[model samples]
Target: MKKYTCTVCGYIYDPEDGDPDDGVNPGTDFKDIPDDWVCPLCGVGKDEFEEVEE
Candidate 1:
């Protein structure tokens, strides 16, 4: 399973639920990330997201 975490606030966004504030809805595919989506904490763009490999 894929997991996501916020880089600025270190907020771990569980894939089981969506980060509505970030526009990442539950079950939303990573590739489907909206172009306008931004970090709710730091306002960082998609480019700021670092993919964590388990």
Candidate 2:
């Protein structure tokens, strides 16, 4: 899979370890995440996320 970073708070989201606190399951692809899924750290919408290098 892939990873993404939240521009608002520098939260690194790894598809292998989804944010279960927010209802995201492990192995979930970034593209498969709900459009309304927001950054758990900063509470910013996923729109603030961008593909990041492993």
Candidate 3:
């Protein structure tokens, strides 16, 4: 699974362990997240997140 990091708050999102607090089911890919989804930690929009380097 791929990982993405929130540039605004440094929150990391992993497909294998979705952000349950935000109602995102586990195994949901980063691309599958709704465009309106915001960072649970900082409330930043999806555009604030970026792909993490492997």
For each candidate, give its TM-score against the true structure. 0.67, 0.89, 0.90
lDDT of 2 at 51: 95
State each model's C-alpha RMSD to the native: 2.0, 1.1, 0.9
Q: Cα miss at 21, model 1 (Å)?
A: 3.9
Candidate 1 lDDT by residue in tens digits, 1-54: 476676776755566676766667788765577867776677777666666688
lDDT per residue as tens, model 3, 1-54: 789999988999989999888789999999999888999889989898999986
The lDDT of each candidate is 0.68, 0.90, 0.90
Per residue, candidate 2 scores C-alpha lDDT tens digits across 1-54 of: 879999989999999999888899999999999899888878999888999974
Ranking the candidates on lDDT from highest down gives 3, 2, 1
Model 1 regions more than 4 Å off: none
Candidate 1 vs candidate 2: the lDDT winner is: 2
TM-score-based ranking, best first?
3, 2, 1
Model number with the top lDDT: 3
In candidate 3, which residue ranges exceed 4 Å CA deviation? Answer: none
